[PDB]
Design a protein around this nucleic acid. Sequence first.
DNA 1: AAGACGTGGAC
DNA 2: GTCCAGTCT
Length: 351
Amino acid sequence: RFPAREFQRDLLDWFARERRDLPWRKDRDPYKVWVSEVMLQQTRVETVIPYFEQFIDRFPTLEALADADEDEVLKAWEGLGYYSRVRNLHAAVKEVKTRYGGKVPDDPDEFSRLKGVGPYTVGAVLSLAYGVPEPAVDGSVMRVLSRLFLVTDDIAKPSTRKRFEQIVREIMAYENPGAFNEALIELGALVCTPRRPSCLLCPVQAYCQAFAEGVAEELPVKMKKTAVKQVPLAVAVLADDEGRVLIRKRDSTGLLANLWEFPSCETDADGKEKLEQMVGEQLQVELTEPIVSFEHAFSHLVWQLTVFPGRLVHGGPVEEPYRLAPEDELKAYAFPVSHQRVWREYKEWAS
DNA sequence: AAGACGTGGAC
DNA sequence: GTCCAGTCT
Ligand code: SF4
Ligand SMILES: [Ca+2]
Ligand SMILES: [Ca+2]
Ligand SMILES: [Ca+2]
């Protein structure tokens, strides 16, 4: 029905001709491919390129990452988002060193056992680094395949992803599977773009049923996103007379897990009040009026932050999860972007 | 299944 | 504003 080998040929030649020279493509080392594929989940390539280089410079091999402290790794991920990806990778890498002696499994079932490795990552890593002919269907590929075969199923359903995965199995180039999988991802990035695809330049315009019908711009099919709750948040920037600041490490479960932050309370509506009470219970502190208010978006909620400066006097030890940090050492802790802005606004207010 | 889970570009 | 650049529970 589908001229698979003709489609494979028109794609793979295009790939050779138009492939971008990205850092993770300098070799096919499984470790580096694994890091890059994780970083690229839900994250733009232009954004990832610098994080990848810092990360591989600090953690050049699978063992260097494994032997690293959890805090050093989170700092290297600081600002990339979805931080459980890196906690899972660290643990998954640890497992590969402890269990598998530092060798990345080439068995899909064995690799998918690792934390943070789901259907896309198994296919991406194993097809590119090891040649395994497993599909690597991400949102981009699903958009490409939904136009090539005019599939109107909701790509959000896992089932739809499984149909596309089956479609890949039928049309794949088993001769060079990794190149086939990367070419579909590259095709999605460069040609078959989310809006206004450049189908006239597309290597596979002849094989595309959506272009035939003139509805490429109407695919893929996807349900509109659920709106996000708004959460007010009260943040305390507290410094003593020696310039040191009070920060706390978030629980290892949930939002921004194991990241550092300035002490805060969700104030659903007394700000300086709910902040002062909380601080004592975990220190004698009295809070002043707020200096700025701003918003910070997550995928599923929006923080509405209010910053309250304050003075801190030591009347006891700083007990876990809190730490007393000189200003010059705050650079060493990983903060979420919201709280990086807290400090920015606080430091510009001080002047 | 659906929500949790960050951040930044492009439209 | 919208859409989008996968995995866990
Ligand atoms: S012809 Fe157009 S819609 Fe079809 S795969 Fe190419 S860019 Fe996408
Ligand atoms: Ca898995
Ligand atoms: Ca993509
Ligand atoms: Ca928690």
